[PDB]
Design a protein around this motif. Structure first.
Motif, PDB file in Angstrom:
ATOM      1  N   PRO A  21       0.693  -1.049   0.017  1.00  0.00           N
ATOM      2  CA  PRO A  21       0.054   0.011  -0.007  1.00  0.00           C
ATOM      3  C   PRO A  21       0.838   1.239  -0.016  1.00  0.00           C
ATOM      4  CG  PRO A  21       0.048  -1.149   2.238  1.00  0.00           C
ATOM      5  CD  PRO A  21       0.872  -1.957   1.225  1.00  0.00           C
ATOM      6  N   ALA A  22       0.303   2.362  -0.769  1.00  0.00           N
ATOM      7  CA  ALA A  22       1.341   3.660  -0.797  1.00  0.00           C
ATOM      8  C   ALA A  22       1.248   3.879   0.685  1.00  0.00           C
ATOM      9  CB  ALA A  22       0.143   4.590  -1.195  1.00  0.00           C
ATOM     10  N   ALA A  23       2.110   4.387   1.422  1.00  0.00           N
ATOM     11  CA  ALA A  23       3.280   5.187   1.346  1.00  0.00           C
ATOM     12  C   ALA A  23       4.215   4.158   2.336  1.00  0.00           C
ATOM     13  CB  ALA A  23       3.010   6.424   1.783  1.00  0.00           C
ATOM     14  N   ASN A  24       3.994   2.776   2.068  1.00  0.00           N
ATOM     15  CA  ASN A  24       4.904   2.137   2.892  1.00  0.00           C
ATOM     16  C   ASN A  24       6.254   1.944   2.339  1.00  0.00           C
ATOM     17  OD1 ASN A  24       3.283  -0.326   4.836  1.00  0.00           O
ATOM     18  ND2 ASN A  24       2.131   1.369   4.012  1.00  0.00           N
ATOM     19  N   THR A  25       7.036   1.392   3.297  1.00  0.00           N
ATOM     20  CA  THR A  25       8.614   1.032   2.711  1.00  0.00           C
ATOM     21  C   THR A  25       8.845  -0.153   2.022  1.00  0.00           C
ATOM     22  OG1 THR A  25       9.515   2.754   4.483  1.00  0.00           O
ATOM     23  CG2 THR A  25      10.939   0.902   3.632  1.00  0.00           C
ATOM     24  N   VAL A  26       9.354  -0.296   1.185  1.00  0.00           N
ATOM     25  CA  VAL A  26       9.757  -1.645   0.324  1.00  0.00           C
ATOM     26  C   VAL A  26      11.248  -1.812   0.315  1.00  0.00           C
ATOM     27  CG1 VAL A  26       7.822  -1.446  -1.211  1.00  0.00           C
ATOM     28  CG2 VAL A  26       9.689  -0.840  -1.865  1.00  0.00           C
ATOM     29  N   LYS A  27      11.509  -3.123   0.580  1.00  0.00           N
ATOM     30  CA  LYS A  27      12.955  -3.450   0.734  1.00  0.00           C
ATOM     31  C   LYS A  27      13.261  -4.654   0.040  1.00  0.00           C
ATOM     32  CE  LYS A  27      16.304  -5.558   3.952  1.00  0.00           C
ATOM     33  NZ  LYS A  27      16.663  -6.468   5.188  1.00  0.00           N
ATOM     34  N   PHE A  28      13.788  -4.495  -1.231  1.00  0.00           N
ATOM     35  CA  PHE A  28      14.445  -5.850  -2.088  1.00  0.00           C
ATOM     36  C   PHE A  28      15.721  -6.233  -1.755  1.00  0.00           C
ATOM     37  CE2 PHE A  28      11.398  -3.590  -5.248  1.00  0.00           C
ATOM     38  CZ  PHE A  28      10.007  -4.496  -5.029  1.00  0.00           C
ATOM     39  N   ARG A  29      16.079  -7.542  -2.007  1.00  0.00           N
ATOM     40  CA  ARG A  29      17.274  -8.057  -1.393  1.00  0.00           C
ATOM     41  C   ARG A  29      17.793  -9.071  -2.585  1.00  0.00           C
ATOM     42  NH1 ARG A  29      16.457  -9.208   4.621  1.00  0.00           N
ATOM     43  NH2 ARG A  29      14.222  -8.306   5.084  1.00  0.00           N
ATOM     44  N   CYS A  30      19.048  -9.232  -2.736  1.00  0.00           N
ATOM     45  CA  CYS A  30      19.543 -10.148  -3.637  1.00  0.00           C
ATOM     46  C   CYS A  30      21.064 -10.372  -3.107  1.00  0.00           C
ATOM     47  CB  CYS A  30      19.762  -9.535  -5.081  1.00  0.00           C
ATOM     48  SG  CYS A  30      18.324  -9.300  -6.085  1.00  0.00           S
ATOM     49  N   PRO A  31      21.007 -11.472  -2.197  1.00  0.00           N
ATOM     50  CA  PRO A  31      22.439 -11.919  -0.985  1.00  0.00           C
ATOM     51  C   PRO A  31      22.965 -12.578  -2.162  1.00  0.00           C
ATOM     52  CG  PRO A  31      19.975 -12.377   0.016  1.00  0.00           C
ATOM     53  CD  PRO A  31      19.716 -11.772  -1.170  1.00  0.00           C
ATOM     54  N   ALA A  32      24.272 -12.226  -2.193  1.00  0.00           N
ATOM     55  CA  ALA A  32      25.054 -12.911  -3.223  1.00  0.00           C
ATOM     56  C   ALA A  32      26.540 -13.069  -2.587  1.00  0.00           C
ATOM     57  CB  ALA A  32      25.286 -11.987  -4.263  1.00  0.00           C
ATOM     58  N   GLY A  33      27.427 -13.925  -3.152  1.00  0.00           N
ATOM     59  CA  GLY A  33      28.784 -14.279  -2.912  1.00  0.00           C
ATOM     60  C   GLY A  33      29.510 -14.457  -4.053  1.00  0.00           C
ATOM     61  N   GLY A  34      30.729 -14.504  -3.915  1.00  0.00           N
ATOM     62  CA  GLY A  34      31.626 -14.804  -5.300  1.00  0.00           C
ATOM     63  C   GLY A  34      33.129 -14.121  -4.678  1.00  0.00           C
ATOM     64  N   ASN A  35      34.007 -14.411  -5.531  1.00  0.00           N
ATOM     65  CA  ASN A  35      35.152 -13.903  -5.244  1.00  0.00           C
ATOM     66  C   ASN A  35      35.989 -13.854  -6.566  1.00  0.00           C
ATOM     67  OD1 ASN A  35      37.930 -13.550  -3.982  1.00  0.00           O
ATOM     68  ND2 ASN A  35      38.228 -15.696  -3.787  1.00  0.00           N
ATOM     69  N   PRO A  36      36.163 -12.364  -6.891  1.00  0.00           N
ATOM     70  CA  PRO A  36      36.130 -11.289  -5.971  1.00  0.00           C
ATOM     71  C   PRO A  36      34.743 -10.841  -5.477  1.00  0.00           C
ATOM     72  CG  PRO A  36      37.252 -10.679  -7.886  1.00  0.00           C
ATOM     73  CD  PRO A  36      36.854 -12.132  -8.017  1.00  0.00           C
TER      74      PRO A  36
END
Length: 100
Positions: A21-36
């Protein structure tokens, strides 16, 4: 032991469709790893998403591979894609946002 990016907690990425619903907060996440350590960037509807694109801009939290938008408004709807890269690869995932 260099390695391509990979998602580390796919459970937090399962739900692709978010209706908020307007005017809430949204938080999207893409947890990743790798080297470097791969860098992360976000696109809105396939194009580079910048601060100047919405009134409130956004916060990117690097240690958490997250995008945060406070007080969503209808013009915020769309597809949000995180692109995680290093020299051994480039990976992406897309969330869809609906502001009710």
């Amino acid at each position: 032991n260099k390695r391509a990016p990979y998602w580390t907690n796919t459970e937090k990425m399962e739900k692709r469709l978010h209706a908020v619903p307007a005017a809430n907060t949204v938080k999207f996440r893409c947890p990743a790893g790798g080297n470097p350590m791969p860098t992360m960037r976000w696109l809105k509807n396939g194009k580079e998403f910048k601060q100047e694109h919405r009134i409130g801009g956004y916060k990117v939290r690097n240690q958490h591979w997250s995008l945060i938008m406070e007080s969503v408004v209808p013009s915020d709807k769309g597809n949000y894609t995180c692109v995680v890269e290093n020299e051994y690869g480039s990976i992406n995932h897309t969330y869809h946002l609906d502001v009710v």
